[PDB]
Design a protein around this ligand. Sequence first.
Ligand SMILES: Nc1ncnc2c1ncn2[C@@H]1O[C@H](COP(=O)(O)OP(=O)(O)OP(=O)(O)O)[C@@H](O)[C@H]1O
Ligand SMILES: [Mg+2]
Lengths: 388, 331
Amino acid sequence: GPDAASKLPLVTPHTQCRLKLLKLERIKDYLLMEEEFIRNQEQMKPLEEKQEEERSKVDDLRGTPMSVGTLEEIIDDNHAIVSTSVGSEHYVSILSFVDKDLLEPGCSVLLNHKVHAVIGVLMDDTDPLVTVMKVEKAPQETYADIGGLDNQIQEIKESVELPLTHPEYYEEMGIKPPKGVILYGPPGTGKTLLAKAVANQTSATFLRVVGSELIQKYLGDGPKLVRELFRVAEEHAPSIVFIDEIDAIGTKRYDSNSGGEREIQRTMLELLNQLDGFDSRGDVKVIMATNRIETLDPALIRPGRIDRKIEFPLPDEKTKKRIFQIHTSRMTLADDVTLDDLIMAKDDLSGADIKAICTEAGLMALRERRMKVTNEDFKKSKENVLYK
Amino acid sequence: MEEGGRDKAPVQPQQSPAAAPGGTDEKPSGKERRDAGDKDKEQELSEEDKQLQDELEMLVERLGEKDTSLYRPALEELRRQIRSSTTSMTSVPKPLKFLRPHYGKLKEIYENMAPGENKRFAADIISVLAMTMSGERECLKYRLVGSQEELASWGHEYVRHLAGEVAKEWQELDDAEKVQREPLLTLVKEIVPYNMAHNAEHEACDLLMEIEQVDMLEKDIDENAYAKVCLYLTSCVNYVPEPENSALLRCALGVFRKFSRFPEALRLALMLNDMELVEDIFTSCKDVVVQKQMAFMLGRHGVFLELSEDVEEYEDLTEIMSNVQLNSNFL
Ligand SMILES: Nc1ncnc2c1ncn2[C@@H]1O[C@H](COP(=O)(O)OP(=O)(O)OP(=O)(O)O)[C@@H](O)[C@H]1O
Ligand SMILES: [Mg+2]
């Protein structure tokens, strides 16, 4: 609603231009007349104080044991039906003291404890679902840290980050930004790394959900979480929703699923609507990451739902060296290990294997209370990770 | 009060400047020779801002606050040589040593004499030399004088020549957004005689560059909104924007014609002798401009019809203008 700050962010002069001065003095004159305008009338008309008298009378009209209940329906204004504490419905009378605006059908209502009526709305406790996927800040991974993938970082920048920092570009050519991005590649290529990189330099509520939690126990509590996921995203202003391992909504079978595949499909048919249905969309951008782009219904990937398909290949030899350097940056090597010699250990190392080598190297140096990794540590590190 | 690393530099060359009080006796010729040569080399190392903090500037800041307060009027003698050197050190400490409420008694310190040819010194600097201080001072002293002592000596009119000089160079200094800086100073001064001051400012600015005058008109729109309570600047304020957009500027006149409507739209004395001035803008936006001025359209045909020769067609044109082209085209 209204914003307490930012009375007039007219910083267009951005200098000592006199235009800044004229507006400021305007309020000062209005303030002066208001001062004696309120106190003067507050003496010969000592009916309402507006500071202690106003609040006082309403409190008496309220009750000491204020009740809490659920508003069930909105009958004509000044009248509503509110569900009592346990199981009863009362045709209460709405009092004007309430804002009369936050009366959503089912949020909350405060009622007098004897003549039950509407006395006031109650803000709804942050539902546990919102807190579950409300990623605050990406801990450490920056955007120059990712390294390697270069032509693939421009697509994500140009779909989920540019339209929020420089909208003019998709503002003068009359082109709406590409709807979504789907990331696909072998197991371990930076798919999620780039996914959390965008969360770093972003100004929107990031939400993350893995494909495995989209499949639930009871029937119907399937394509109902999908509705909740996109209901939270809309309520939270600009937001990037990240679905990870989307290939778990029909690639993995779980006994907890009361309904079998037939139930999982209806989850997809609800996810299909939530990405492109005849409802309004607003500002919500979907990033889907998967390691098997060939095992999902070719309608979830239809242009319009997800537009830009980004392909993540196994690291190139030149990029392999960059991966080692970034991961080994904060490591006191023993000027005896050569990075180039370990670049060729197996025909194709994902890159997540590179970090595994550089992380097991340290654990192989801790065992000897040594703060310098030698070629022996890496040699045994390169065998304990990608061999067994 | 202390120095490090480069301590040697500020030690040897400072004894002579500090020896001035003791060098004025028995050494009549020593002082003059050193000053002449030091001036040339000083500017080379000053124009470059390679040091965040000025080491030399702070040294004199202390003794200059009190020494200059009583020494300046101590002599009160006009000398050809002393005046040039004296004015040099007055401007340097103004921004920092002088506090905001100190220009009340500063009228006699700067009005009496000018700093020689400081114009060259005010061109290299962008906005930090004297632009901030110069404008603020005139906003207070002048107003009080005109309240009851508007009649004064010729000194009041001397400052008029000063105003014109500044505007001629600020616009082209950088061609950046700072161009809009000039109008602020002229507004405060000459509240009543605003027209006379503006006549000189735009006389030279328009000739220097042609197209860079359009941006100026924009600042005029918002300026008039914050007018005075008294109903005295409702007519004079609306006349200034006209002369600039005349034949002295681009002949588009699209905004010129609109400018006449501000003075309550007194059509009897603003454009009544304006349509026939050009006689060659019939196909231009001249016709369209009047199409948004439904204030004196009834009397338009009173003079236009009697012409019967200024226009190729004089009867058919008027008929098809009212609503013939409005409803038919859309449907
Ligand atoms: N190209 C790369 N550049 C930098 N780090 C990489 C790269 N590829 C993998 N990594 C590292 O691999 C580690 C573990 O795997 P990672 O999180 O990157 O997997 P992923 O590529 O997103 O794959 P998946 O979708 O299978 O989870 C990450 O912490 C990341 O730093
Ligand atoms: Mg992943």
